[PDB]
Design a protein around this ligand. Structure first.
Ligand SMILES: CC(=O)N[C@@H]1[C@@H](O)[C@H](O)[C@@H](CO)O[C@H]1O
Ligand SMILES: [Cl-]
Ligand SMILES: [Cl-]
Ligand SMILES: [Cl-]
Ligand SMILES: [Cl-]
Ligand SMILES: [Cl-]
Ligand SMILES: [Cl-]
Ligand SMILES: [Cl-]
Ligand SMILES: [Cl-]
Ligand SMILES: [Cl-]
Ligand SMILES: [Cu+2]
Length: 228
């Protein structure tokens, strides 16, 4: 359980959607982060993978604001403290807004995978995962925006999938968090995208999995990584 509280881009902080605060206030601020209704700080499990909740989390709506990113710049997402038990991959996607991200129809977003990290070491099951790297980095993840994609406005869909209960069907816990970015530079690719509701299925080999056994490999969920 947790959420993204802060985003660091080009030497400033952009506050996140504080789902434990803003849903209870009259006058929540405009932010680059999507609003959600996930006030339990929880997840979308496999029962939700073919529902709109998986796109940017339960009840999500676009952020009002969009953050510029320098060409090939970084976006650092800072989480609330991530539980050690919640082992799993960290995955990042972009989808073009083709206009202002604040007015996009989330159900039409076509995401391409720009980064993925999975099982890092398995000397001591259940092992060390990308989520454990995130914890070790004081609950942070750094995304590098590709220089090879067409400039424009994009949604970044940043996600942890916790696998501590994933031995049974619909037991994996997905924690998507979306933010709005303006990508800048000289790239030209328009990578092939996947609708949010087509990213995952509840029988995928990196979804329906017993992490407590020895693992010789791990198939990170979702469509293929884009590399320009
Ligand atoms: C940003 C980062 O890399 N890690 C820090 C570490 O340098 C400092 O040891 C720690 C004391 O736990 O707060 C965390
Ligand atoms: Cl709100
Ligand atoms: Cl505001
Ligand atoms: Cl305000
Ligand atoms: Cl925690
Ligand atoms: Cl655009
Ligand atoms: Cl270990
Ligand atoms: Cl471990
Ligand atoms: Cl362009
Ligand atoms: Cl496998
Ligand atoms: Cu949890």
């Amino acid at each position: 359980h947790g959420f993204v509280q802060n985003i660091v881009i080009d030497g400033k902080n952009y506050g996140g959607y504080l789902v434990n605060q803003y849903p209870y206030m009259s006058n929540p601020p405009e932010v680059i982060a999507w609003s959600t209704t996930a006030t339990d700080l929880g997840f979308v499990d496999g029962t939700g993978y073919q529902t709109p909740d998986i796109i940017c989390h339960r009840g999500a709506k676009p952020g009002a604001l969009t953050a510029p990113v320098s060409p090939g710049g970084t976006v650092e997402l800072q989480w609330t403290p991530w539980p050690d038990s919640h082992h799993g991959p960290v995955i990042n996607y972009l989808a073009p807004c083709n206009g202002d991200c604040s007015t996009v129809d989330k159900t039409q977003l076509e995401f391409f995978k720009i980064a993925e990290s999975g099982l890092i070491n398995d000397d001591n099951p259940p092992g060390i995962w990308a989520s454990d790297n995130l914890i070790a980095a004081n609950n942070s993840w750094t995304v590098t925006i590709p220089t090879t994609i067409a400039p424009g406005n994009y949604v970044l869909r940043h996600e942890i999938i916790a696998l501590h209960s994933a031995q049974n069907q619909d037991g994996a816990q997905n924690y998507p968090q979306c933010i709005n970015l303006q990508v800048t530079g000289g790239g030209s690719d328009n990578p092939a995208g996947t609708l949010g509701t087509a990213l995952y299925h509840d029988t995928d080999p990196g979804i329906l999995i017993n992490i407590y056994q020895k693992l010789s490999s791990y198939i990170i969920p979702g469509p293929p990584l884009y590399t320009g």
